[PDB]
RNA sequence: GGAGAGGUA
């Protein structure tokens, strides 16, 4: 009575490439709910992520033209472009650059990839172009980000086309309670995080953000 | 009706849900014109004869016209209900406040 | 596509004029986000005049609301079509079966008023997937009357105005493709023969995609 | 800051008559160099006026009769 | 036929499943309604008024 | 950037001793609800507390009679009794002693305290005698304990009431500061039992979660 | 400025 167990990281088993799972144990009465539910919004409100933020194709005036060559308009480029994965190192801010010229899909593996930046998903499709003799060559630049920035709230030349942010790197969180079994003692729980993220975060990285967090920002309280 | 104005970092006229009886405003599309009065005298008589915690009776009849309308009655329709075997029956509380701390 | 519809979307799809139908079944020898070309069976042939199908499409066209309609190849290299069949969808289409809006997960329950007579709380993955943004194409007309005092005419250099808001407008005075206007512009600078300049609409955004000039027989034509 | 003019109104038992007197006092207060009789919080002078008329410090019959007297002072003013 | 197209999949027959609030994560009781319905945006932006 | 806005506690309102109202400006767009919530689990549920377990009446063998010389039943007096605030410094569980006789009121300021053992509200009425020669001596049993808990999950016994907070609600609304816009505002508003000021309590609770999150970061 | 058509509540 009067003192509590403290939690701890079990196992973070990989269940697949971009499906996670995490176990929290042990955990006394009243508290699966109440951490649940606070990292369940931490992590599916501000987990920083990598995104792309504008685009710079060779011989395009602006979004809404078309390109001979290439089968989708601009727009649609833009658009798969938006929800490509990858994750670098140390730089907040690169730069990659993309040249391809035959026919065929345009995947993510054909971009020139520097040493730090990493693409997760090498089949992510872009365009397809059909013509032996038309080429696509762009350069796309790479940020860092805390959440979701439209095109139009943030803050040159008529080449710069720019997309609309969406760092986030998870996307569905559930969570369940379920008693353990501790060498003897009733009414002791254990959580399980389930985390469904974009393959661009490690779990338990993403887990120990969203602790330390709301720790540091729970300190107003203390001292007041 | 008169109002105070909270500004509001939108595009649509906000509108306290009480008063929509008053108006007849249902919220499928309704548009509300804003006028503003300049000299003194408008404005203090805004504030003491429209302002809208001071027509709260119609002036057809004495019937009050802030009637909770459609939702909140529902509400509190559920709220005070009994069914004959629920969770903790019997028991005894020390007043108003400890029965809400015991259903939170 | 919406999920669930009544049978009847086909024959609304193609029987109005948006769709681009085919008119000889075919093989498909060179796809493009513009034209389309379809090579024709050898039984649907002429004797003689053997050519081969081609079809082009009417890319983004301001309707007469103002939303615009362009029209996307549904098909690749090497798929074979028949007669009657659908091959570019037009606007608000889905292989060919009409499709105007989007199907979206719904839940019956009040939520603390904001639902209140008839109103909807909308989550932020419906913005932020942008899965509702509607394009839009407005028209501005600008013309040079022939007036007292002489005419006037649309050079470039206007009175009392810092060089910043011209930064937009080329030597001759007309916008140049491509720049991203915003409220309260200057795409055409006219004189009053002595201030008469068009200016965008105050709280319109947006990018210009198209400019043209009709000029009046007897009358030289300035570089633009 | 006022929601209601219910206690005013009690004062002064007409709510129109309501409107001119307090009306004058905040004429009194913006155009004119007088100033208020009870501490302001960062409020404008038509809810200070009604304010005032509230503690029942200014009627109507009392402000006519200081400015009957302001009014005589004045007249000697001029000596 | 909607009801075995629904038991063809694992989702409960009766089409009303429980949820759970966002803010304090407690229970919503009587189970309430979710599915998939097709809704369109009309041409009467908040914009042009 | 991916920095958070720490701020300082804004305002604390004491309305009355046991009631206040502390307001906390401003916060990220949408954690209102994150904090104000684990704080509000974290006080209703667990804390440690010393309230009232167990009865024993001089002269009533079970809970189904009624004394000769109360004007109430049983069941009331031992509801008046839940309520009562002891405080224990030293020792966990104790039992503690009274004995009344006479017409008048019975107040817990009359019983036979012991340093250690801490009345909050001493005017806490608890019977009325009847009889000017009718008298009852009764002993109560107080331990340490995480809540509400029913008697039969465990002599005369009563429900328990281990916690020094009585109310805990809280809205969000937006509010502004130096050049900034759109974030939320936190406005806690507590109402404890004297058993200790609720500041304090505040400061116990955002301890206790802080503490259990640790071996996370 | 005036007519005609369509639309919203
Ligand atoms: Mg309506």
Not at chain 2, 4 to 26: F, M, R, S, T, W
Not at chain 3, 85 to 92: C, H, Q, T, Y
Request: with cysteine; net charge negative.
């Amino acid at each position: 009575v009067t003192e509590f167990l403290k939690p701890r990281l079990v196992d973070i088993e990989q269940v697949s490439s971009t499906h996670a799972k995490v176990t929290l144990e042990p955990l006394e009465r009243g508290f699966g709910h109440t951490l649940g539910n606070a990292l369940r919004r931490i992590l599916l409100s501000s987990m920083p992520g990598c995104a792309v933020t504008e685009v710079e194709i060779d011989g395009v005036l602006h979004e809404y033209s078309t390109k001979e060559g290439v089968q989708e308009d601009i727009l649609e480029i833009l658009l798969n472009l938006k929800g490509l994965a990858v994750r670098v190192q140390g730089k907040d801010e690169v730069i990659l650059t993309l040249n391809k010229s035959g026919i065929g899909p345009v995947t993510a593996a054909d971009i020139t990839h520097d040493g730090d930046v990493e693409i997760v998903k090498p089949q992510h499709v872009i365009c397809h172009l059909t013509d032996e003799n038309a080429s696509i060559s762009m350069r796309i630049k790479v940020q860092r980000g805390r959440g979701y920035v439209p095109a139009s709230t943030r803050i040159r030349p008529i080449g710069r086309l720019l997309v609309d942010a969406c760092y986030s790197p998870v996307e569905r969180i559930a969570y369940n309670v379920e008693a353990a079994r501790v060498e003897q003692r009733t009414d002791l729980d254990k959580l399980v995080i389930e985390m469904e993220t974009n393959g661009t975060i490690d779990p338990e990285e993403a887990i120990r953000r969203a602790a330390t967090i709301l720790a540091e920002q729970l300190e107003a309280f203390v001292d007041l | 009706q008169a109002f105070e104005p909270v500004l509001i970092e939108g595009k649509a006229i906000q509108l306290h849900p009480l008063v929509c009886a008053a108006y007849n405003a249902d919220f499928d599309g309704d548009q509300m014109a804003v006028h503003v009065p300049l000299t003194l005298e408008a404005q203090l008589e805004a504030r003491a004869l429209m302002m809208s915690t001071n027509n709260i009776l119609s002036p057809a009849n004495g019937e009050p016209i802030i009637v909770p309308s459609q939702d909140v009655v529902l509400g509190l329709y559920y709220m005070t209900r009994d069914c004959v075997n629920a969770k903790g029956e019997g028991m005894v509380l020390t007043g108003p406040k400890e029965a809400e701390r015991l259903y939170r | 596509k919406p999920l669930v519809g009544t049978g009847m979307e086909r024959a609304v799809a193609v029987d109005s004029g948006v769709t681009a139908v085919a008119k000889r079944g075919g093989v498909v020898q060179y796809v493009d986000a513009s034209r389309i070309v379809i090579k024709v069976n050898e039984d649907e042939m002429y004797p003689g005049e053997a050519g081969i199908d081609i079809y082009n499409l009417t890319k983004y066209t301001r309707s007469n609301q103002n939303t615009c309609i362009n029209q996307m190849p549904c098909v690749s290299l090497g798929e074979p079509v028949e007669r009657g069949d659908v091959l570019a969808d037009g606007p608000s289409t889905d292989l060919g079966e009409l499709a105007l809006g989007q199907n979206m997960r719904v839940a019956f329950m009040p939520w603390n008023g904001y639902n209140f007579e008839d109103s909807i709380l909308v989550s932020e993955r419906v913005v932020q997937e942008d899965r509702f943004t509607t394009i839009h194409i407005q028209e501005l007309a600008c013309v040079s009357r022939d007036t007292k005092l002489g005419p006037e005419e649309i050079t470039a250099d206007i009175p009392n105005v810092g060089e910043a808001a011209l930064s937009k407008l080329d030597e001759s005075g007309i916008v140049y493709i491509g720049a991203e206007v915003t409220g309260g512009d200057i795409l055409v600078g006219k004189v009053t023969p002595k201030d008469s300049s068009l200016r965008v609409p105050n709280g319109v955004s947006g990018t210009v995609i198209d400019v043209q000039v009709f000029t009046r027989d007897g009358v030289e034509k300035d570089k633009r | 800051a006022r929601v209601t003019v219910q206690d005013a109104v009690e004062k002064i038992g007409n709510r129109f008559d309501l409107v001119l007197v307090a009306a004058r006092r905040a004429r009194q207060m913006q155009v004119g160099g007088k100033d208020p009789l009870v501490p302001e919080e960062n409020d404008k002078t038509t809810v200070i006026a009604l304010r005032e008329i509230e503690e029942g410090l200014i009627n109507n019959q009392i402000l006519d009769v200081r400015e009957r007297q302001e009014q005589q002072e004045q007249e000697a003013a001029e000596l | 036929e909607i009801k075995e197209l629904l038991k063809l999949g694992d989702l409960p027959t009766s089409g009303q499943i429980r949820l759970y609030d966002g803010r304090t994560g407690e229970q919503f009781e009587r189970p309430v309604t979710v599915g998939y319905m097709y809704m369109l945006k009309l041409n009467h932006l908040v914009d042009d008024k």
